Amino acid sequence: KQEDQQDQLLKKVNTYIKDNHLKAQMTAKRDERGVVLVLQEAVLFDTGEAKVLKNAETLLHQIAVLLQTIPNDIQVEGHTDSRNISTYRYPSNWELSAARASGVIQYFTSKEKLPSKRFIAVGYADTKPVKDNKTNEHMKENRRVEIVIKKS
Amino acid sequence: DTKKQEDQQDQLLKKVNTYIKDNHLKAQMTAKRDERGVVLVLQEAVLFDTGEAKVLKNAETLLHQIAVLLQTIPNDIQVEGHTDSRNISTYRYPSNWELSAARASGVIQYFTSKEKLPSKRFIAVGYADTKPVKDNKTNEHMKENRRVEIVIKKS
Structure with a gap:
């Protein structure tokens, strides 16, 4: 069911995104980590800053x-x-x-x-780019926060 | 499989403990193994001053x-x-x-x-106070909770 559980969680997340009209603020995907919410830097922070x-x-x-x-x-x-x-x-x-x-x-x-024991903060610096940093387009998408919903 | 990989972790911990002993580092770090891998434990006072993150x-x-x-x-x-x-x-x-x-x-x-050391080998992880060593009732327990763990991950 870990395969079906992961499909059903991703469908639930994508249903929440649609029902709440959040498609332009966030995307959702699945990978080995689980179900991941991707938020571009612009919907969270100023440039070079970390204050919400x-x-x-x-x-x-x-x-x-x-x-x-x-x-x-x-x-x-x-x-x-x-x-x-x-x-x-x-x-x-x-x-x-x-x-x-x-x-x-x-x-x-x-x-x-939300209970603090549910969370872990992880920093990757620039070690996990989407593609690369050769263009301003490519560097922009690397500035992103990913909220990983781990397998349960 | 695991026994081949856990015996491998056993040898790595022994190597780490020997490195600590041979370089007279026992008072500055300890090492242990758990599900995460082989872990170096460093109390905060060997790395930072109170309330700061500058090495x-x-x-x-x-x-x-x-x-x-x-x-x-x-x-x-x-x-x-x-x-x-x-x-x-x-x-x-x-x-x-x-x-x-x-x-x-x-x-x-x-x-x-x-x-x-190559950047690709590292990830930074913050737990706040969600993973104490025992508790935060006493001053000595709060002190040991303020620590850095360097986790050597499995292969």
Whole structure:
């Protein structure tokens, strides 16, 4: 059923995306990790920052409403492009990617009250690009947060 | 299958423990094995000052000695940050999720930017206070919860 369970979870997620008119804010897919929600950087953060935008709070609440209806563990993954960052607040792409996953989880737990034990923050820096970083188009899609719904 | 792979993990842990003994590192790190793989445990005070995620200069010798050991094996590495239940809300770290993740990231950045270990071998992981060693009732238990674990993943 792990095969059927994964299909049924992905259909439930895609049904939630459609019923809530969220297609332009997020996509959903399945891979070896489980069912993954992909959010581009622009719907969550400013450039080079990890603070959840105020206009992102409605989207994250809508995701949290879906997440409360399932028991699976959640892994929030942060990613950067290969562009160098080196500020006081984010001394490398490792810190930036991990701070973005952390900011999403802090929203889910502190303000939507989902149980903290359901979450793990993961930072990949630029080690998992979609394709590459040779163009501005390609670097843009690498700046993304992925919410992994693990197998249960 | 597993017995071939668990006996392999047994030999890796023995190698790690021997590396710790031979380099006089017992007071600065321990090693263990569990379902994740072979894990190096470093208490926060050998890496960071209180409430910060910047690697201390005096930790760089230990991280170099760890990097030399990691260069001899191909395994993927997961660096895990852990906090206690003490709340933090500063400019650089709005909460324990951020602090734990930044501490894992600072260790990895040193490995990749200073020791030349390939970035593709690492992932940074933050657990906040969701994985204590025992509890957060006493000062000694809260202290041991503030730790970094370097997980040598299976092959």
